[PDB]
Amino acid sequence: MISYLKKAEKTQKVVTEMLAEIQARGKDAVRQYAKQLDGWSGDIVLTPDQIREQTKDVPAGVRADIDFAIRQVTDFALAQRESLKEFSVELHPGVTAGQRVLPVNVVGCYAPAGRYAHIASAYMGVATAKAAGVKTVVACSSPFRGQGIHPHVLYAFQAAGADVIMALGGVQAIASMAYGLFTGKPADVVVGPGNKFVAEAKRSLYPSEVAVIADETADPAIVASDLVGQAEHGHESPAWLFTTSRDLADRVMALVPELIAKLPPTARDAATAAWRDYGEVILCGTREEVVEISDRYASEHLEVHTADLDWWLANLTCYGSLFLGEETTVAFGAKTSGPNGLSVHKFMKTLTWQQMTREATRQIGQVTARISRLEGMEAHARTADDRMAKYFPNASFEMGTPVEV
Amino acid sequence: MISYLKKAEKTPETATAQKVVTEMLAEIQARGKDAVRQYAKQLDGWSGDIVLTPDQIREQTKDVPAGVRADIDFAIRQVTDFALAQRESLKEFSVELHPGVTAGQRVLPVNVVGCYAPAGRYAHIASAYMGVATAKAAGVKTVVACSSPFRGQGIHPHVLYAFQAAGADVIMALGGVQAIASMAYGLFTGKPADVVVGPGNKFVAEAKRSLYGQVGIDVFAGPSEVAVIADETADPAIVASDLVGQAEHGHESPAWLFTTSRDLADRVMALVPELIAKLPPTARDAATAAWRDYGEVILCGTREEVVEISDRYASEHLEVHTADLDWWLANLTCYGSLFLGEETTVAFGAKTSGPNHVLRYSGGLSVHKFMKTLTWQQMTREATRQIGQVTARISRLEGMEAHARTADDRMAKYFPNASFEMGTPVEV
Ligand SMILES: NC(=O)c1ccc[n+]([C@@H]2O[C@H](COP(=O)([O-])OP(=O)(O)OC[C@H]3O[C@@H](n4cnc5c(N)ncnc54)[C@H](O)[C@@H]3O)[C@@H](O)[C@H]2O)c1
Ligand SMILES: [Zn+2]
Ligand SMILES: [Zn+2]
């Protein structure tokens, strides 16, 4: 049986004008919107010199940390890129068919550079696009108080391998990258988290979760810590626990409030609200039942603190990213993003092709002709007839009764 | 050096579809199977059973002769064979990252796919089997197939035979929106569809969009297209024949020729009318308007300029009749599927369907549409020694104290007798 030991309490046109204006008047309109919305009166596209001077203050220790975190994304993305293979294959004898795998040409990456945003928000798209083999990555981020892009966001963009960096925000950023203003290189896709105008802009042109699965072997102090971890994001950050153990369920429900109370003010408020409004706890009969619930919820970030982790890897089917075991944790960072998803696959295209010998068309031609004529597709059948006549001049095959209607 | 020797004399959109679907879905959500059954009666005049039994399937396909079956069987196998190969091209793996960190990709099929087949008068039998065959090749466990009943007897017997031979698990005599919704909600089966595919009218399209969003519109829809890239070595009689091939579909089927050979362009432009004129009445009428209004011939200077304009047009079906086929394969970047060389042709059938390029590049009907990649990670204790520090220091810079403490807790548990610079805690 399933028991809800805790349940959740609670549960756009401006874009049309701006885009119509930007489309009509181009870079001119982007500059005005920059000054009107962001007070930005300076250059949009940063030079190599501007980038190094604006990030000169960033210390060596901070750079090393960010460099390390990027490498953990990049190094997975590199492996993942190779998981989609090109191939040839022979179907019917003399029929060859295959798949090419191309990166897209241009990716645009937006980062908000606001407060209580992960620096990961700035480097994930850029680092992923580059590992996928995209040759042009354009990164935008809104300027901080007419001083430029937040140095940490700017350092991240650069270290992640962005090719062009533009101090530009909101709808102007997305439109610019999509229409290819300032670079003359339209983005095949734009990615990155932002506000509601940003999201609707990306819609017209083209809340942080955490779940923990746990059994009796789990350490509730860590579980509770992990739930609290993402709870501090905002007031609408779900935090779910799915367990087969009442003891853990109760013990966690007892520690979470205490850990929240020990947080600093802003994080205390956020987590207090979030745990109350969207926090959930679910006790279940079997493992097999937990799966069912987990898969229905499909958390963006799913931790699994149980015995027999292989079983859970094998049997779970719906989630953004899986954190397997206690040691890793959501805060260490997902390598990808689930469906908002963001991975190398988002920036990769397959193209399929086929080729035939004449010998192959002997059978394929006559089947096609007969089928086409049963379909009433006389012109179709005739593309088969013509090849038969050219390749097999004195052949008489059953090519089907010609259409008269 | 680009020159339009023949221009399109028309352009390719009202959403009255939106009204009907919103109403119909609203209704079907309320009353379920009874609303579906009632819509079948009002729209199609249908009163029979919905879910076919194995008996009914054999019964209704009994008058499909052995020779016709063998041809369909053959055509389905070609799709299956490509699909199985294409499935093998997306691999599972694990990789070591920072020492003690393991990460990886799981690849698995979706549970349930719904396939719709318009099964009208001028549809290809391939439309019935391509969805179903691809879904099964992908390892989808439940495939549900729907087609509106033909003439009071049931599903068109060729369509029904195709569904069965392609490996559909459940077959249902439903048309239009009510078929799409039934498959989406899992009416009659208790198995809601993860995706629904299959061509149809603007209502079927709108119903898919409404229910699935992007994954519901990302497959090539609209009239059948054909493009041919041809150089001086191409045979104009074959080229003209291939263009006319798809132009008979209807009045809005575009047929494009991109060529570096003025000579070929002129010969094709003269041959097409002659070929159309020799078609039977229905086809003649279809192709005449199709070519007149939507036929294009583009003469280019170099190979690069043909690539430029081909990628812009991005035909669902692109033939390449040139020398040096390896080069064209290497340099073309946007198309539904490629027919390399003169020997193969569009009517032999692509083994996938390309993206909805007229919305853009992503999507289409292949095994890839029916498969998910899930990523995972796992760490030893030792791995966290470095990762926890970094996370802690980064989190505190972000003002994320709770985040940092998830690392503090692990550092304290795994490494009691050790101290690390975990950043200065947040006070705000
Ligand atoms: N170029 C090609 O390759 C090709 C070939 C054949 C058909 N088509 C296109 O496919 C479509 C086939 O048309 P179809 O009618 O057979 O579609 P369909 O077979 O996809 O759907 C038919 C069903 O639609 C429903 N329906 C019809 N009119 C409706 C209405 N006004 N309101 C609500 N439901 C309604 C009915 O239930 C009917 O059974 C057309 O758009 C045609 O142009 C293209
Ligand atoms: Zn977070
Ligand atoms: Zn066709």
Residue numbers in the entry:
A (entry chain B): 1 to 11, 20 to 214, 225 to 358, 372 to 436
B (entry chain A): 1 to 12, 15 to 361, 368 to 436
What is written in the article reporting this PDB entry?
Kinetic analysis of CpHpsN reveals a strict preference for R-DHPS, catalyzing its 4-electron oxidation to R-SL, with high specificity for NAD+ over NADP+. CpHpsN forms a domain-swapped tight dimer with 28% of surface area buried at the dimer interface, with the interface featuring extensive hydrophobic and hydrogen-bond interactions. Domain 4 lies at the C-terminus and contributes to the active site and is also involved in dimerization through a metal binding site.
To probe the roles of Glu318, His319 and Asp352, we conducted site-directed mutagenesis to convert each residue independently to Ala. No activity was detected for the D352A mutant of CpHpsN, most likely due to the inability to form a productive zinc-coordination complex with substrate. The 3D structure of the CpHpsN D352A mutant in complex with Zn2+ and NAD+ was solved and refined to 2.23 Å resolution and is essentially identical to the CpHpsN·Zn2+·NADH structure in the ‘open’ conformation.
